[PDB]
Amino acid sequence: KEKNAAEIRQQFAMTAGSPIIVNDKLERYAEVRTAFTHPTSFFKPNYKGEVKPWFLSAYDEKVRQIENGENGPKMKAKNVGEARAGRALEAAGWTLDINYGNIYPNRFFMLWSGETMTNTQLWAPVGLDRRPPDTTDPVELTNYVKFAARMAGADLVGVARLNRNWVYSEAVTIPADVPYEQSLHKEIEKPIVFKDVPLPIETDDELIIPNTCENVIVAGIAMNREMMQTAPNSMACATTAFCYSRMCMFDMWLCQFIRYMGYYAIPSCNGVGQSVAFAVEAGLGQASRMGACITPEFGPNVRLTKVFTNMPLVPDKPIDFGVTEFCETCKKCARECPSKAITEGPRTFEGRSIHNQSGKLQWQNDYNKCLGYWPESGGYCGVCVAVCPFTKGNIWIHDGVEWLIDNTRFLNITEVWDGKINTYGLDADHFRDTVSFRKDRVK
Amino acid sequence: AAEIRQQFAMTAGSPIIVNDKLERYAEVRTAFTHPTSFFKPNYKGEVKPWFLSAYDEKVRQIENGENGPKMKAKNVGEARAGRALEAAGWTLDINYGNIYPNRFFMLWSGETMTNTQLWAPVGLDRRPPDTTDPVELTNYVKFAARMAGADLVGVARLNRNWVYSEAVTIPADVPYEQSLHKEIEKPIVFKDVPLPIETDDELIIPNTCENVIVAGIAMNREMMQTAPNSMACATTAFCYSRMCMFDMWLCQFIRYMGYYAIPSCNGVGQSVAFAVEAGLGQASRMGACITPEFGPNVRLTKVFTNMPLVPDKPIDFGVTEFCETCKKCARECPSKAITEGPRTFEGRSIHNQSGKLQWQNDYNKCLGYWPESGGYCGVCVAVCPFTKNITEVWDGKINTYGLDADHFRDTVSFRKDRV
Ligand SMILES: Oc1ccc(Cl)cc1
Ligand SMILES: Oc1ccc(Cl)cc1
Ligand code: SF4
Ligand code: SF4
Ligand code: SF4
Ligand code: SF4
């Protein structure tokens, strides 16, 4: 029986309701606390023992590896030139992304209004962004916006009511008068608040999200299987990097579509809020031991972005295809983790350290150990994504009645350069899994 | 499809036949920019810049619940959605085509880019090439091209005949909001310089700039087949932003490999000529490069570089003789812009480059239909055999970037087909 992603998602759809279990310890999380930004984790030694901002220490190891003809830690490349090309590809992938993740809200690519964008100015005479909506039916809007999402480069798209618990209490950002070359040295915190205002707006003191901002649209941006399996080496960094620029194009494309439909839209990429939680509530997949959203189509080998809007939409249903029960007995990522950051124990409500948000049932991982391995290996690792059985494209079987997971799955870089590739690193042998008709965009 | 292309490979050599009259072409001559063709009346009779008259028609259609010229939409909401999708698709494109060289997204050096600054400590762009082998480099840069969103990619030696003699651009310090009012003409010249450079007077391409990399960027068949209505505009627009992201992605990669790279999108030179010389496809009667995978329903962009590379072979799979007897685009063209006669060396008007053997088309008649229809037409692309209502499109099949899984296997690539 030919693999049917729409059948699979229908079979495992849940009934409405956020699936994330929480208790009263839960409060919104200040984005400064992520290991990338918090002062307790931000500094790491390089290979000479010099303590630097982690990404500068990682740079030192990238340079070292190229000079020694390596594609990763102790991993010899075919020659220096191949070591060079992998890092060149990686660096180029980030072309449309600011400071590793586009996290500063209402700066650069992440503008909360379209009014200053070159494309909005060019189209101003048509007035699409000033004309009131001609569609208010959530059903038709869900079909329109999901079609646009797919055009905008999403391999998966889902809708959920916006749960403010996952919105950062305060954002990391920079002052509006600071130019790019100073951005890394002038980062600040700024509260994200919800107020009774008509449009998203930023004051000197606050990022203000309107109380009418009802919905969140979550996009899955698929990474390349062959490149990710080279984790923690350079080609895994490259597919990661290219997908961040894909995320950026997505947010901007979709926000402009939403505005031109007569609503407002907030982009985010890696900022504003926690993408895994939004993705779970929008039904893209389930939370996992490693901490990522695992999807039926790609496993965890998919990046996430999201857009916030007041456009009426029909929320999608959450999905339960057994990931919690497989993670409970699998532990492959925990055992392969080069830094031992992923726990082998049970889910709790108690954060392991400042980097976890306490008050939600989840596997609690030590994300400072994880970041610690990035300067050491000179990349973004990804070994956990690479070894997860759900990242295999072969995991689904049909028994003549229904779909199930094959339990048997839970029991070099020259060839990547020389081997299969296709547009955006997508795989034509699986590209049918994300074909979409109206019946699977809205019900 | 990888076997079809080698089956139809020609011997080396540009397949574009020229005579002793051919001269490089001033970009200002195109119908989009030339003063003889730039102004067009709107439906009220008011004479305006053509795209502004076209705006007026889009507004009138939305108010009247139309997806195109006297093409009724399901309702006003649907009419609004098509135009909203078209407008959004242009987000990463400056003034319809990114033609101004070394401006906005089309920077001829990576040095001021945020990505380059962030990565400056690694020094990939300052470091001499570690690979000078054109065979390895051709495999690397084509892999990168596919990552960067190209559905097709080819290499050719740079034929300077198809580089514009003078570019349309703006002065460097002019803010975006004045750009449309302050466009100027600027010579593109080749000189013995290390790097691509712009002075007050000239865009200077180095004489070392040996090669051009041509990308094909596939458009959605269902959407294009609504030409000349709004969904054909939307797939046109979205692919222009894909072109821009391709140019920047690939230029950055080529720069981080130790070479220089010039983006262009719709600027700098004539895409169709470059695509034929790079083996992507064959010139056609409508004027487009017809490819075996997509026919003409594919956009083009290109990057120029001194990176050593193995040129591809031009391809002959019978387009010229098929166009010789087909004439379907000529008969369907709403403006009678496409000729039904033979190919000549003599342009029909100022918008053609004379001196090369091609079907000569009147591109001002084409442009005139765009304000009238409120779109970018595309009927020729839609009806062309090689290429094979709006509610059903909005309700029907779609996939990432508007690509089609029933055909996506045809652009799978391995090293054997890359070099
Ligand atoms: O998710 C991320 C964020 C930063 C970096 Cl360098 C890599 C991946
Ligand atoms: O090729 C082009 C150029 C400009 C426009 Cl408006 C549409 C298509
Ligand atoms: S490797 Fe196993 S335990 Fe880890 S996320 Fe994947 S399925 Fe869950
Ligand atoms: S990215 Fe690497 S270090 Fe981090 S949790 Fe995954 S396997 Fe461990
Ligand atoms: S775009 Fe339309 S008007 Fe122009 S040549 Fe093609 S069919 Fe004719
Ligand atoms: S419609 Fe016919 S004549 Fe026109 S370009 Fe296509 S094949 Fe050639």
Author numbering:
A (entry chain A): 3 to 413, 431 to 462
B (entry chain B): 7 to 394, 431 to 461
Please give me the paper's original passages concerning this structure.
PceA dehalogenated 4-iodophenol (4-IP) three times faster than 4-BP, while 4-chlorophenol (4-CP) was not converted. Activity measurements using 4-CP, 4-BP and 4-IP showed an enhanced reduction rate with decreasing electronegativity of the halogen substituent from chloride to iodide. The position and orientation of the analogues 4-CP, 4-BP and 4-IP in the active site of substrate–enzyme complexes is thereby identical, independent of the type of halogen. It has to be concluded that exclusively the differences in the energy of the various carbon–halogen bonds determine the displacement or continuance of the substituent.
